[PDB]
A paper describes a structure:
The Very Low-Density Lipoprotein Receptor (VLDLR) is an entry receptor for the prototypic alphavirus Semliki Forest Virus (SFV). The mature alphavirus virion is approximately 70 nanometers in diameter and has T = 4 icosahedral symmetry. Trimers of E1-E2 heterodimers are organized into 80 trimeric spikes on the virion surface. The LBD is comprised of eight cysteine-rich complement-type repeats, also known as LA domains (LA1 to LA8), which contribute to binding with SFV.
To elucidate the precise mechanism of SFV-VLDLR recognition, the single LA repeats (LA2-Fc, LA3-Fc, or LA5-Fc) in complex with the native SFV virion and SFV virion alone were firstly reconstructed by cryo-EM. To increase the resolution, a block-based reconstruction algorithm was applied, which improved the resolutions of SFV virion, SFV-LA3-Fc, and SFV-LA5-Fc to 3.02 Å, 3.45 Å, and 3.55 Å, respectively. In the structure of LA3-SFV, LA3 binds to the DIII domain of each E1 protein at both the 5’ and 2’ symmetry axis regions. What sets LA3 apart from LA5 is the length of the loop between the N-terminal strands which in LA3 is two residues longer than in LA5. We found that LA3 engages with the beta-sheet of E1-DIII through its EF-like motif, creating an interaction area of 323 Å2. The residues R114, E117, Q126, D135, E137, D139, and H116 on LA3 form hydrogen bonds and salt bridges with E1’s K347, K345, N325, E292, and D327. Meanwhile, LA3’s P129 and W132 engage in weak hydrophobic interactions with E1’s G326. As expected, most single mutations (E117A, P129S, W132A, D135A, E137A, and D139A) in LA3 resulted in a loss of SFV binding ability, while R114A and Q126A reduced the LA3 binding affinity to the virus. Analysis of the fully saturated LA-bound structures revealed that LA3 can bind independently at site-1-3 and site-1’-3’, satisfying the conditions for simultaneous binding at all six sites.
Author numbering:
A (entry chain F): 1 to 438
B (entry chain G): 196 to 244
C (entry chain I): 267 to 422
Write the structure that this text describes.
Amino acid sequence: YEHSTVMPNVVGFPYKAHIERPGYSPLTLQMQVVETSLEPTLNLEYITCEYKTVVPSPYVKCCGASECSTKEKPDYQCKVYTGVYPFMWGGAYCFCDSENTQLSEAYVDRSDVCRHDHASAYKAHTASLKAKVRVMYGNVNQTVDVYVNGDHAVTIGGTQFIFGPLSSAWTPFDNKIVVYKDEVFNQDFPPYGSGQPGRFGDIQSRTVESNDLYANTALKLARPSPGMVHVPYTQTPSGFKYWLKEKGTALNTKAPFGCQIKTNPVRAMNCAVGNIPVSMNLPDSAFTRIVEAPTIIDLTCTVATCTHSSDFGGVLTLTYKTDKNGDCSVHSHSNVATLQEATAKVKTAGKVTLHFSTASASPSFVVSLCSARATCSASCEPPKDHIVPYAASHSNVVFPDMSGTALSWVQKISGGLGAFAIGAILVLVVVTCIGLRR
Amino acid sequence: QPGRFGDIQSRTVESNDLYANTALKLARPSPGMVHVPYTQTPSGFKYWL
Amino acid sequence: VPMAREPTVIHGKREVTLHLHPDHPTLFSYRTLGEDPQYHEEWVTAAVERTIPVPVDGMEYHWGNNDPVRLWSQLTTEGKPHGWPHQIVQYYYGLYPAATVSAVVGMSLLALISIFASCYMLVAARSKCLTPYALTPGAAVPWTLGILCCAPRAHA
Ligand SMILES: *[C@@H]1O[C@H](CO)[C@@H](O[C@@H]2O[C@H](CO)[C@@H](O[C@@H]3O[C@H](CO)[C@@H](O)[C@H](O)[C@@H]3O)[C@H](O)[C@H]2NC(C)=O)[C@H](O)[C@H]1NC(C)=O
Ligand SMILES: *[C@@H]1O[C@H](CO)[C@@H](O[C@@H]2O[C@H](CO)[C@@H](O[C@@H]3O[C@H](CO)[C@@H](O)[C@H](O)[C@@H]3O)[C@H](O)[C@H]2NC(C)=O)[C@H](O)[C@H]1NC(C)=O
């Protein structure tokens, strides 16, 4: 028996589905989203880490001149300085007074621990959603793992469930993502090959194991001081360290809809938005023949107390007449009030009580016990406590019933004014028709 | 109230009775240790000072 | 690493007053877990006191090394529902204090327009039904004189 429904994408919401087969007794399923996981799709762009400037020892040519040679190294710098007269601890070598030349060489290289402490630049698109839903009904419990898209059917006790695609298409990750350890940042990194000194991605490596490197840190060399051998140089500080110091905020503590960001793999878990359509296919053995189920007649609904609070703050009573005792499948046919249970023991006494949760001043919903029906209306008082540590258990609908107190007052006032207006119109029409009849 | 002036009070200096409300809560000791942990809101007299 | 003490919470109307007692600089951060969050994070050093908003959507705050704690507000107000008309307005003004005023104003102007139109219709009808008899020195038909309050009560 094919059936379909739509359930909210809220973790912990006690969604209950009512299935009515005309030839059998009604059935009530309880589905609950224990956990979700929004996995995006990534394409690694490059890897950034601190750099390490290596300066080989200078070559001083005594009584001669040296020529610089170019090399294919990331951000290579080389110069030759004429007229140096170096010194050492014991005495000044390069015995020539002024015919000497020093060659200075330096270049940038990837750091030592770049494979342990590095930031990755990604591109995120077309996120895929996952869930973990607990389904219980009849006498069968059990939690299953599903993909939330209409391409995965899981069997729970002989019943096939398909969870349709999410209603919305909202993902907290922007187009470009930077991931560092256990933090995700919505950043706009420069493209490969066009980094800038002193900021994020001054040196860019296509992969942690890639040999190629692109470094741009404005390395420069300066003439050595007289009577020294030190190879002076100047260089703009690392961009990775200064990114660490002033990266600013994150996505873990900034994501909307109250959903945590994680890493390895990147995913936004337990993130409440949209609706999850559901498709089912139940076998003939799940239902019970109408002969076995008890009969319920003369169903009357009365509300003892009501309070539109987050917890189940309402109490409901049902009176009936029955031939034999057994079980029934209670349900509320409007989302104004969310019941607590999906089964109730009916007995020859003729009284049973149910608890519901509502968020409106005056609710109006129809409740069914097995095959019976009954309409309930009530007046509800606000709660006294200001803040609670648990989420709401109602669907958050606040418009009161048309038979409520406020709407009854509006109806009475509008009816009086309309009666006055109709009287005025009738008097004017009578006067005009009397004038015309002559 | 804990953390503010007069979190502990006594009728007089030599009075035997004492009222204390400092939110003293015990915690489970770590495995393989004997240290009886706890947590407590700091003194209200010092923060008043 | 150490875990800092839990703060003291005081509940308000969609607000939490939060007493913070650190020993060494700890990080305090919170966010409102709705559609548009309210972001904030700070390095609390000395004993301070914070007020943080808690809408109906809820919010979470992260104090030091402790696990984040979530708090949800509740649909509470100050008016009296199912009472006199001036109390239902208070009840629905404590909740959503931006649409109740607009709805009340709209209904009031609609009522005023309707009553003014009805009064205008009555006045126009009386003018139509009284002027033909006001062009001749004739009797006012005491039967009709009593029914409709015309200008001459008894003078002709
Ligand atoms: C031992 O020390 C002497 C210096 O007292 C060194 O002699 C120097 O040798 C270099 C090249 O070997 C000379 O440089 C060039 O020499 C040419 C010669 O025509 C000249 O035209 C250039 O302008 C330039 O000066 C340098 O002049 C010369 N100095 C002298 C002779 O006073 C000698 O090389 C040292 N021994 C060794 C093994 O290097
Ligand atoms: C369907 O299966 C689930 C999971 O087996 C059932 O939920 C489980 O209910 C039991 C009974 O309360 C929980 O055990 C108790 O949990 C409390 C929680 O504080 C703990 O203090 C007790 O010491 C005891 O362990 C159990 O935790 C809970 N499982 C989960 C994952 O929440 C559920 O009741 C079953 N459905 C029906 C209709 O029985």
